[PDB]
Structure 1
Amino acid sequence: TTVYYDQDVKTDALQGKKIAVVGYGSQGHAHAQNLKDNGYDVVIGIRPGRSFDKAKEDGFDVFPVAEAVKQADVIMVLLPDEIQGDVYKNEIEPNLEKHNALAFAHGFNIHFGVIQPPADVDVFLVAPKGPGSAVPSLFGIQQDASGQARNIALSYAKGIGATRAGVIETTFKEETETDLFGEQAVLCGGVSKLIQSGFETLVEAGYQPELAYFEVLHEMKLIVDLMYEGGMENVRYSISNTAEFGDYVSGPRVITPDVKENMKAVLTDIQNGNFSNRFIEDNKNGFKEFYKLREEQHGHQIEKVGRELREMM
């Protein structure tokens, strides 16, 4: 466990260099504005559109992506994972230089070999956490060509404010596989069908879908907020003895040990690469499987019940 804080970072390896934040999403605006706030020459390279325009109205200098990397000394690629492959080949790699940084916030395209950087460029990762009211961030290194890849990555995490709560060192493999697993097994995929199958149980049992919507979904924010502030022991403390007791004896009944075996099964396909190439080759086929799965989820009763409760009268 190596944790670097603001006082741990001593030199300013980032000053004197120009920064190219590729893309202007929620994280692109967060990185780009946090650097100019600390007196850094930050540039933004994105395609023309509504986020191109928005970056202009926020006082930023927006350019095509092929010129922004020509201009800068550190390129932070914050584009969607599915489009980073071809944007790197047609707009970033032909305009690369020597001894300067190819940064990322997620190591999907790097760890899975989709983006192969040359030897004479530093390739690091800096992944902010939580608000992106400070949560420790992560950072890692794939290549060290300039001899200052560590101090460039750590001073960049300091520039975006990621070192205020401390940055934890990791690898491109560890950040990619733990991020992908949490989304699939717990946070997104795991919880959503956990809420769906609970909602379907109550509705099929003759209970009102509105009362079922509160008990399996809307009431979770309070439980999750308690866990976010004081951990799981805070939830067990704040909830009633009847609720805490039911947690203990019925939790393992729902999440049987076989569910844990399913989590290790999906983690295996994240490590070998079965998930990555499946998500990529479906993207090359117009996202047919992806879009069909997205649209079919809207046919669930729980989503319609939710919007009807939100459009109250």
Structure 2
Amino acid sequence: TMKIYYEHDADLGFILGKKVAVLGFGSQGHAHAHNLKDSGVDVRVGLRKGSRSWEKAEAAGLRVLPVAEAVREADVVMVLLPDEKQAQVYREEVEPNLKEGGALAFAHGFNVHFGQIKPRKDLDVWMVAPKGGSGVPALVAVHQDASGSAFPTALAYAKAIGAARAGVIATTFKDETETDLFGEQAVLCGGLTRLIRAGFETLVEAGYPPEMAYFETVHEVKLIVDLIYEAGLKGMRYSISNTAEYGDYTRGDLAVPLEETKRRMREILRQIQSGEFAREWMLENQVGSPVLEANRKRWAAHPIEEVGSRLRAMMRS
């Protein structure tokens, strides 16, 4: 019971007559700028002079300018910088230089949802969040519609990128931002890495060889997750051995008890929704990311890395 929009719903007329400034040239900057030019919209990439990304962008054959300049001549500014760098670039280099009635666009809602960018009341503010006809759907959301055509423009932008093919889902900046932070913290990276680490340490402390601990706790994860990707949980259960399936159904809850886990995950979500997580992260970046650099180091020293590196080398032959 959700509103899906396709290529047929989106009209490239709302973008093709507009100048798009792509700020930043990571994986996202690369792909955004690439697929836009190959759909016949004039793109300029805004970068800092004499950067590694400056030369990489010219090598891909794109028009490259300083950030302030790229913005001065743009109708849509698509901001594809790290969350922690966006607010400063907006204040110093986008806010003063973006034409009135212009559009300010995002791939992530974080800085707008948590008020690190308080955009001018005259701008359109929208987001296209991607996740040939490879089946990559996208989210689209509009925070602010000054012109009356933010949503058609955003939908056109998704068409011009190739995201409309598999379907564009309409949402809000709130729901995009809060579900992204939740996934990262509770499941995708935070929870999963802790579960693997506890598995590996359990076997190694019980005196099983580290090499075999690594195979049964890290290397074999891909096999399971590929099945979930293709055919969901019930497909995954169907394909695994009955012994595996029986163990899963009767001992999974002992590993990860449902009500306790749901309680702890509700606290993770509370800190996201309350703004406490955003505050923590914003302040962390004000003082040189001490905790990030400290944790990186402790986790890079973990015995699981030595064994992992040896076995991945051994397999590459």
TM-score (norm 2): 0.96
Specify the alignment match of 2:83 in structure 1: 81
Deviations 1:53-101 (A, max 9, x none): 1000001011111111111110000000011111111111111221221
Aligned partners of 1:90, 1:195: CA distance in 2, in Å? Answer: 43
Distance, in Å, in 1 between the alignment partners of 2:89 and 2:127 is: 18
Hey, what does 1:107 align to over in structure 2? 109
* Structure 1: tracts of 5 or more residues without a match: none
- Among the aligned pairs, what percent are the same residue? 58
Is 1:293 aligned to residue 295 of structure 2?
Answer: yes
> 2:142 corresponds to which residue?
141
Aligned to 1:249: 250
Give the 3-state SS of the residue equivalent to 2:105 in structure 1: strand
Which of 82, 104, 121 aligns to 2:123? It is 121
User: Is 2:281 the counterpart of 1:274?
Assistant: no
Once structures 1 and 2 are overlaid, which stretch shifts more, 104-113 or 290-299? 290-299
For residue 141 of structure 1, give the secondary structure of its aligned residue in structure 2: strand
CA–CA separation in structure 1 for the residues paired with 2:251 and 2:66: 56
**Partner of residue 186, structure 1:** 187
Amino acid at match of 1:196: R
Segments of structure 2 that go 5 or more residues without pairing to the other structure are none
Superposed CA deviations along residues 155-192 of structure 1, whole A, max 9, x for unmatched, are: 00111111000100111110000000000100011100
Q: 2:41: which partner in 1? A: 40
CA distance in 1, matches of 2:225, 2:136: 16
**Structure-2 separation of matches of 1:255 and 1:24:** 40
Specify the alignment match of 1:20 in structure 2: 21
Tell me how far apart the structure 2 counterparts of residues 139 and 269 of structure 1 sit (CA, whole Å).
Answer: 25
For residue 208 of structure 2, give the secondary structure of its aligned residue in structure 1.
Answer: coil
After TM superposition, give the deviation of residue 10 of structure 1 in Å.
Answer: 3.6
Q: After TM superposition, give the deviation of residue 11 of structure 1 in Å.
A: 5.3
Is the 2:54–2:64 Cα contact (8 Å) retained in structure 1? Answer: yes
1:284 maps to which residue? 286
User: 1-side partners of 2:12 and 2:57: how far apart?
Assistant: 30
Matched letter for residue 181 of structure 2: L
CA distance in 2, matches of 1:75, 1:249: 53
Moved over 2 A (4+): none
Aligned to 1:95: 97
CA apart distance, 1:135: 2.3
Number of equivalent positions: 311
Find the aligned partners of 1:53 and 1:135 in 2 and give their Cα distance.
29
Q: Is the 8 A contact 2:21 2:43 kept in 1?
A: yes
Among 54, 57, 70, the alignment partner of 1:55 is: 57
Give the aligned residue type for 2:183: G
**1:151 and 2:152 are equivalent in the alignment:** yes
